[PDB]
Design an enzyme around this catalytic site. Structure first.
Site, PDB file in Angstrom:
ATOM      1  N   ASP A   1      -8.841  11.342   1.821  1.00  0.00           N
ATOM      2  CA  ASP A   1      -9.316  12.550   2.519  1.00  0.00           C
ATOM      3  C   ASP A   1      -8.290  13.604   2.952  1.00  0.00           C
ATOM      4  OD1 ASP A   1     -11.969  11.907   2.146  1.00  0.00           O
ATOM      5  OD2 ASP A   1     -12.147  10.840   4.046  1.00  0.00           O
TER       6      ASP A   1
ATOM      7  N   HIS B   1     -19.266  15.174   0.764  1.00  0.00           N
ATOM      8  CA  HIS B   1     -18.218  15.175  -0.264  1.00  0.00           C
ATOM      9  C   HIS B   1     -18.768  15.013  -1.673  1.00  0.00           C
ATOM     10  CE1 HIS B   1     -15.224  13.364   2.912  1.00  0.00           C
ATOM     11  NE2 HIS B   1     -15.647  14.573   3.237  1.00  0.00           N
TER      12      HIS B   1
ATOM     13  N   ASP C   1     -17.342  13.622  -4.038  1.00  0.00           N
ATOM     14  CA  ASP C   1     -16.984  12.320  -4.603  1.00  0.00           C
ATOM     15  C   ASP C   1     -17.985  11.221  -4.236  1.00  0.00           C
ATOM     16  OD1 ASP C   1     -16.189  11.475  -2.049  1.00  0.00           O
ATOM     17  OD2 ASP C   1     -14.113  11.079  -2.604  1.00  0.00           O
TER      18      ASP C   1
ATOM     19  N   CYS D   1     -11.932   2.327   3.969  1.00  0.00           N
ATOM     20  CA  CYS D   1     -10.737   2.300   3.142  1.00  0.00           C
ATOM     21  C   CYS D   1     -10.667   3.547   2.320  1.00  0.00           C
ATOM     22  CB  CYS D   1     -10.810   1.161   2.136  1.00  0.00           C
ATOM     23  SG  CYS D   1     -11.096  -0.399   2.854  1.00  0.00           S
TER      24      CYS D   1
END
Ligand SMILES: [Ca+2]
Ligand SMILES: [Ca+2]
Ligand SMILES: [Ca+2]
Ligand SMILES: [Ca+2]
Lengths: 633, 633
Positions: free
Chosen positions: B329, B437, B439, B613
């Site tokens: 990030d 996001h 992603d 994570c």
């Protein structure tokens, strides 16, 4: 051309608007009941359906019994070529089957309403708004270039037209609306006008612009056109390229508190037309002059010059808020053009903060030195430089050397001129002059009977050579400034000028300054010595080491085609004629240029380096269209 | 090539420096004594002289007795091809004659010192500084393009070289000096380093940059080279194109309080290299991960995946000033390249305001939403779109609809990415997701053994189809989240999911959001359905009507060539295997992609939609050089 995703929904009907010019890809696999093996489909007359498996497509009949294996890689492609009407039932139905029987175990439908939506502008630049130009979403330069052009409103029949063209049934299906919109950024660059209530009248209202970023449009059925007028609010500038966008979207209602989905968007691009300056070689239309009421010789001689032409004369007097030269210094005549229309546009920069009449647009400026005056702004004729053509000429602005700490035109005005791009400005060196204007040392004149032109340069070396010749010839006692009574006690003769040693040194230096400019002009305008004529000039240095005219600068002249109004120099009299006048005639007249000397100083009885009148000529625009140029990136 | 004005002075000598690559035009008429009729000339061995009358030129011998009529239209053209030495006497002398006798009545001389001055850079982009590239004063894109490239100092052997090459006699003549300079505007874009005192050591000092706009250079005689190193101070951005200029001028002293005249100026242009992002298809070098110290399964499984490759693993833990995902990030791995050198460059945007080691450059950010995280920044593989090639791919950034009032990445970051130009960014719609996001919903993977790639899209419809199938097959009571003890009391089964009516409606809506993105991706990346694979995903709506993952989003995966680290989904167990894992393997494995599921959540005992994570992969740069691209104007 554009593929849109529309999925069948498990055991249901999906209703969707189809916008012509797109097509759908349709997932049938996800809506299949668990355990289903194969599918079949039916479709209506005006819907074309292909079954697509692994990229391979096959058209399907309206009512087939054909069945295909259900697979994620087997989908539908759904196309329509014509808008729906009230007689339409446009649909595709998919039947699902299990391994066992031939009666369908379920079905999923797709019900369609086809509409045409196109936001149209004149992208091909003929003055007519063509139907859906495929290039309307871009803007390209040159003879083959396309995209629409917008005029700044410098003050709506003359604005740009934008037409929303639609075709469809009596109403949009439930949950849809059409919205026109612009970005926040573009909101101070444009405005758009529309008649919101045509049933109640012709009244046009501002629907997009400052503080209005979107407008919901009323849908009317059948074939409809909605006419909009668009204006630019400002010229290209330092942070603004000139390009703006306007969008129309078909929006779908999802639920409360959820934004509407833009299921189709059409975009048009406009470029705002740049401000363009007119060089001395273009045909004169009107001559504007300003002076004091009693400068009679000036007004009479200007009137006589203008009477040799077809031009009209406009006389302005002096105002409290403006300089003595304001028509030259505070006003610059230029133009803007779009395919449908063009008009003259004046840059106005009042000294302290009338006009020309209604035919002109006006751009008025919202720290300042003399270099900000429009006497310091000139433009060349069309030139070719190292193979690169500048069909509108190049703007010339006087400045000081980079490391000098000298004066410069304000960045705001320099940035504006640069941002117009089509005149590719060049900086010269004017700061060696007290007033600091390029028009004090240089001008352009056509060569009559040809398509060519000359650069005229002030030359002190030319003046000294002439004066030395007259002295050798026995004319050393010839007096200057004849008829200016306030100069008489000075008794200035050729002898007195030539004997002044410090004045010689000052003028050698000023000739170096002139020559530095000559070299920049030759380089950036692609000129040779054959393109230049030097006229005699003389200056006196001030306390800042800057030049003021010793006698009126003849180079700043009124150019009306072959006829030249030249400031009367008041030079040494030889055989009862001014030797400066005779010299200048001898240079210019063989080319077919007709010289008229104009006395702007006699009314003041003396000349101290300052000119108290101004003139400016409004010219016809270039016939070359600016959008046909291709500027450097 | 360039003509410079140098006039003879009446009855005197003029001394001038001649800079090779120019030539002089010389007025002899103005220096002529009054009454003089004709002139003759002599010149030295290394000076070439032509007499030019009305454009027609004729070469003149060193000692001629030839005479020409004095006229303003008859001048000299003076050329030198080689620099002066101490053995040189370079001169032209002009004799003047009257009508009567053949003995000269006066003479005017010109004494010359020729020098070579060239400011040189590597404009041809081979890593060597070539001598005086004629194109060094411009910058053009593409395989045939030229002009020098500059690297930003993201932290001097690796900076750009600039060489001032001179040739001449022992010293410059009196009154001259050489100065290097830049504009005020460029002063925060560049810096230039030089050894000012080479006799006292090797010490390099900053001579041009912030607060230093000019530097006087020491002239050394003979053939000399002065080496400079140049650095860029910043990347292209909203108001900065990336282009900067550096100049050298030969200045002439005139007098006290008068600025020095720039009699010759040479210019070089640099373009500052853009920051470039690396897509998942490029070869992996290093894998960076962050997690809590005790997430053992995660570290072990990532280590095992990485051990299947030649990549190195770098483990980072959690910090007080950073997010749980910070390596994903707050950090983005990219690179810059110049012909001579290139290096990886990390964008760093710390949450509250370590690193990678010395091999990396760092750009750290100087109001913010989740959409500013680099999880919201992705880049496509090279693509061709409607015939236009994007050889470096296109950057993808998540946003909200224009009329929505939703979240958007800050303008500052958007402007930066756009200004790099070579990745032509595209906005997608991420704002329907709680975290927001891109992603979370999409990724790219290579197809092993080919030069091709696939787009992977999250699909809720795929998940519902799979679950409906398993229910039909008698698996309705299969439980999810096996092994997460904090989920057990919820007893979530396929049956419980499929029976939840509001959850079905939420996920149909999320599939519409996904499909809207699918259409933008197909349009702007030039993809067809054959280029896309859908992976099952499921979300739950929050109070803002935004989506959070119901089970881990498998699409956000570690791509190392053929090997894929995929988040472990914890799906319903069928015959003691996760049906989501088996499904995804069945989609990917036939293509030669090897799947490793990585459990990042077990350590937390439950999954609420948040991942604790992060991973990021540093990749080899594109082999295609960015300067070989030709971006749209
Ligand atoms: Ca048209
Ligand atoms: Ca002007
Ligand atoms: Ca090179
Ligand atoms: Ca990213």
């Amino acid at each position: 051309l554009r593929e849109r995703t529309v999925r069948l929904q498990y055991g249901s009907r999906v209703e969707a608007v189809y916008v012509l010019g797109t097509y759908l890809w349709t997932d049938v696999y996800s809506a299949a009941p668990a355990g289903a093996q194969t599918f079949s489909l039916k479709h209506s007359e005006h819907v074309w359906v292909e079954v697509v498996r692994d990229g391979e497509a096959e058209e399907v009949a309206t009512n087939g019994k054909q069945r295909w294996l259900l697979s994620p890689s087997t989908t539908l492609r759904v196309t329509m070529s014509q808008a729906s009407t009230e007689a339409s039932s446009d649909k595709v139905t998919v039947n699902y089957y299990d391994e066992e029987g031939s009666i369908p175990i379920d079905q999923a439908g797709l019900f369609l309403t086809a509409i045409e939506i196109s936001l149209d502008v004149d992208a091909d630049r003929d003055g007519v708004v063509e139907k859906n130009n495929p290039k309307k979403a871009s803007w390209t330069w040159g003879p083959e270039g396309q995209g629409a052009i917008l005029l700044v409103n410098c003050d709506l029949k003359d604005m740009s037209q934008m037409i929303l063209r639609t075709k469809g049934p009596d109403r949009l299906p439930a949950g849809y609306e059409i919205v026109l919109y612009i970005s926040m950024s573009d909101s101070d660059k444009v405005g758009v006008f529309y008649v919101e209530n045509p049933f109640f009248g012709q009244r046009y209202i501002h629907i997009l612009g400052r503080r209005k970023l979107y407008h919901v449009v009323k849908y009317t059925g059948g074939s409809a056109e909605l006419l909009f007028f668009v204006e630019g609010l400002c010229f290209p500038d330092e942070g603004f390229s000139g390009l703006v966008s306007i969008h129309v979207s078909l929006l779908e209602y999802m639920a409360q508190d959820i934004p509407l989905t833009p299921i189709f968007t059409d975009t048009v691009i406009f470029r705002i037309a740049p401000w363009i300056m007119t060089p001395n070689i273009l045909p004169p239309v009107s001559v504007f002059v300003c002076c004091m009421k009693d400068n009679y010789l000036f007004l009479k001689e200007v009137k006589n010059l203008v009477e040799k032409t077809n031009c009209e004369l406009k006389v302005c007097f002096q105002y409290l808020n403006r300089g003595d030269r304001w028509i030259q210094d505070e006003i610059e005549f230029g133009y803007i053009e779009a395919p449908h229309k063009g008009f003259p546009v004046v840059l106005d920069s009042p000294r302290d903060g009338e006009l020309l009449g209604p035919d002109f647009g006006y751009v008025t400026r919202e720290s300042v030195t003399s270099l900000d005056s429009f006497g310091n702004l000139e433009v060349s004729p069309p030139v070719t430089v190292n193979g690169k053509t500048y069909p509108l000429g190049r703007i010339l602005i006087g400045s000081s050397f980079p490391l000098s700490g000298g004066r410069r035109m304000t960045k705001v005005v320099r940035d504006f001129l640069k941002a117009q791009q089509v005149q590719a400005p060049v900086e010269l060196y004017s700061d060696w002059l007290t007033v600091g204007h390029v028009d004090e040392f240089m001008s352009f004149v056509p060569i009559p009977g040809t398509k060519k032109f000359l650069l005229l340069m002030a030359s002190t070396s030319a003046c000294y050579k002439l004066f030395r010749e007259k002295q050798k010839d026995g004319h050393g006692e010839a007096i200057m400034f004849k008829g200016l009574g306030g100069m008489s006690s000075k008794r200035i003769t050729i002898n007195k000028i030539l004997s002044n040693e410090s004045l010689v040194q000052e003028n050698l230096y000023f000739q170096r300054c002139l020559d530095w400019n000559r070299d920049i002009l030759k380089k950036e305008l692609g000129l040779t010595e054959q393109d230049i004529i030097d006229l005699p000039a003389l200056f006196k240095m001030d306390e800042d080491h800057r030049a003021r005219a010793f006698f009126p600068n003849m180079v700043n002249m009124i150019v009306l085609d072959k006829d030249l109004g030249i400031p009367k120099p008041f030079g040494p009299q030889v055989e009862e004629e001014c030797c400066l006048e005779m010299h200048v005639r001898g240079l210019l007249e063989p080319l077919g240029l007709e010289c008229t000397f104009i006395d702007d100083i006699s009314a003041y009885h003396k000349f101290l380096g300052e000119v108290h009148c101004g003139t400016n000529v409004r010219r016809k625009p270039f016939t070359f269209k600016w959008w046909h140029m291709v500027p450097s990136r």
